[PDB]
Amino acid sequence: DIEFINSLLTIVWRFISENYSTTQEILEFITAAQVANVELTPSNIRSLCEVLVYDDKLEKVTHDCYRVTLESILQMSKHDKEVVYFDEW
């Protein structure tokens, strides 16, 4: 219920920096058993994989594993200007 969706905002924070990490599903098999909180099942295999899958978490490379590139950089008007949006046209 409410207990759900709030448990994924914690354990995924800093583990990224310590990750080439071989065998994509082992990455969960690693993450699944850890912190002694003992996460439950392969339901989490496809969870942190395909949820955070986009934009700078970890890069997707073949033979089932994760790479890292540009997240290291992110972890590190007078009269008229911009407004950049809406206005239609």
Binding site: I5, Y54, T69, K81, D87
Partner: protein, 539 residues
């Protein structure tokens, strides 16, 4: 209230007003009239200008005509009819105003890529030459050489002239080079259907093969005519060094200017995905191979005719095979750390550029490695686009954009599960995402043909509609930008005229610094989003 919010101008001028805005700053009055009308009504005739506006007949038209021709702001075509006489129709020409929207940006790359000559007299020299080129719109060599002072070094400015031909950049003036792509195809299309002396009524589909194949080889010789020809430029009579033809004139070109910035976009993606050294290693490759790389020149047959449903690929992959051919065949064999301004072989730094590919950079052939110009563009459009939404809205808008792009067309059931966290905030940013286009809406019913609500929903596609929304970003940003910059002129016009005559008082110097401030910042904003639009114009 008071309308000062600029809602008045907001609705009614998509594309359009862009053109006649620029040329207004260029010239104004009559010049903006003709072009603006040449856009709105499209194809136009000389007599037709007089009818519409009552434009100060035949004094202005003949004056504007030659004025538009020198800078080639009008695409020119002439033909006749079966009845008789003659007709001359004008089109809005290519993007030639966009070049006027470029100017110094082109001259920038001209100065910066003129290196391999180290900080020389060149800076003041060709800057005077190039500014004389674009402004006049056409430059003959001898009349240009005549403008140079006497009793001095004549080949000092010709030290870089034959160096202006270079590889890309300035090419010769040739004939029909300005011409509608649709029309030249139709003009070349003659002598093809015209070709058969009552041969034989067998296999009607062979008329296809005949006309097409003969048109393609006749099309290639025409488009590669301006591309690379060493006849005029490489002329080398005795009692001198290599000297460009004193007769044939020159013109600037799309080739390496549109390429140089395209490489920048690749560098921006590169530099993001690798170190500074790796971006340099990949750069030195591009600098040598940019000559034979079509890239920006890609479609070239697209405008002016049909593609197909069936034969679309037989057209497309016919281009893809010649996009396979020239990059595969011609391009460089493996070199070693060529020159440059890490010892031994740097190919190891290429191998780390190899093993890591997705999205781009270094997919290879046995014995030779090069980056494809076909499959590269999709991941280039992806990145930049996702960074646009990233800059625009918060991190939530990012994550959901791909969530629709992993699989396709699904309901909120597996979306709520697989996306991140909370229903209500998702619904909030769902409406924010679905606000302007780009996800569309899916239409499928529930236990009825067409009835009512509770029908199932899905989210998908709209690649081109999520492209064009960045083409709205083209004009309307630059519009108010340039406009209220021009309004800044006429407002302070009484001051500017006083400043020009002076070239006094405490408060007169104040508004002098004011406008100049606003001016410098508004041009920096122009080139800013200019670089953004340029990448979005393709695919």
């Amino acid at each position: 209230v008071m309308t000062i919010s600029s809602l008045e101008q907001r609705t009614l001028n998509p594309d359009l007003f862009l053109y006649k805005e620029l040329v207004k700053a260029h010239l104004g009055e009559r010049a903006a009239s003709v072009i603006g009308m040449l856009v709105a009504l499209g194809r136009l005739s000389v007599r037709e200008l007089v009818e519409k506006i009552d434009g100060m007949d035949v004094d202005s038209v003949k004056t504007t005509l030659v004025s538009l021709t020198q800078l080639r702001c009008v695409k020119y075509l002439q033909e006749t009819a079966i009845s008789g006489k003659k007709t001359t129709y004008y089109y809005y020409n290519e993007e030639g105003i966009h070049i006027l929207l470029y100017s110094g940006l082109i001259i920038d790359e001209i100065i910066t890529q003129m290196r391999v000559n180290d900080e020389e007299e060149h800076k003041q020299l060709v800057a005077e030459i190039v500014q004389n080129v674009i402004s006049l719109g056409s430059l003959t060599v001898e009349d240009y050489l005549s403008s140079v002072t006497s009793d001095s070094m004549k080949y000092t400015i010709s030290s870089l002239f034959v160096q202006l031909c270079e590889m890309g950049y300035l090419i010769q003036i040739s004939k029909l080079h300005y011409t509608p792509i649709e029309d030249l195809w139709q003009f070349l299309y003659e002598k093809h259907y015209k070709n058969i002396p009552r041969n034989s009524p067998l296999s009607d589909l062979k008329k296809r093969s005949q006309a097409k194949m003969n048109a393609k080889t006749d099309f290639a010789k025409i488009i590669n005519k301006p591309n690379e020809l060493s006849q005029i430029l490489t002329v080398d009579p005795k009692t001198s060094l290599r000297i460009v033809k004193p007769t044939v004139s020159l013109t600037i070109n799309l080739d390496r200017f549109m390429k140089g910035r395209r490489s920048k976009q690749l560098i921006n993606l590169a530099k993001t995905r690798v170190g500074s050294v790796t971006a340099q290693v990949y750069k030195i490759a591009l600098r040598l191979t940019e000559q034979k790389s079509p890239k920006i020149r890609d479609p070239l047959t697209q405008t002016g005719l049909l593609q197909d449903l069936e034969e679309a690929k037989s057209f497309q992959d016919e281009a893809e095979l010649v996009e396979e051919k020239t990059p595969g065949l011609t391009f460089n064999a493996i070199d070693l750390a060529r020159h440059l301004p890490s010892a031994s072989l740097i190919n190891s730094h290429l191998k780390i550029l190899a093993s890591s590919n997705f999205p781009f950079l270094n997919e290879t052939k046995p014995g030779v490695y090069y980056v494809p110009y076909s499959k590269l563009m999709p991941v280039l459009k992806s990145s930049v686009y996702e960074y646009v939404i990233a800059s625009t809205l918060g991190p939530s808008a990012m994550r959901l954009s791909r969530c629709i792009r992993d699989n396709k067309l699904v309901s909120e059931k597996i979306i709520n599960s697989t996306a991140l966290m909370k229903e209500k905030d998702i619904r909030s940013t769902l409406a924010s995402l679905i606000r302007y286009n780009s996800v569309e809406i899916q239409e499928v019913p529930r236990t009825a043909d067409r009835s009512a609500s509770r029908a199932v929903f899905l989210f998908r596609c709209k690649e081109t509609h999520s492209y064009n929304f960045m083409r709205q970003n083209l004009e309307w940003n630059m519009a108010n930008l340039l406009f209220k910059k021009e309004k800044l002129k006429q407002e302070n016009s009484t001051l500017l005229k006083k400043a020009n005559r002076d070239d006094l008082l405490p408060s007169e110097l104040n508004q002098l610094k004011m406008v100049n401030e606003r001016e410098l910042n508004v041009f920096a904003r122009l080139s800013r989003l200019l670089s953004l639009w340029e990448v979005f114009q393709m695919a």
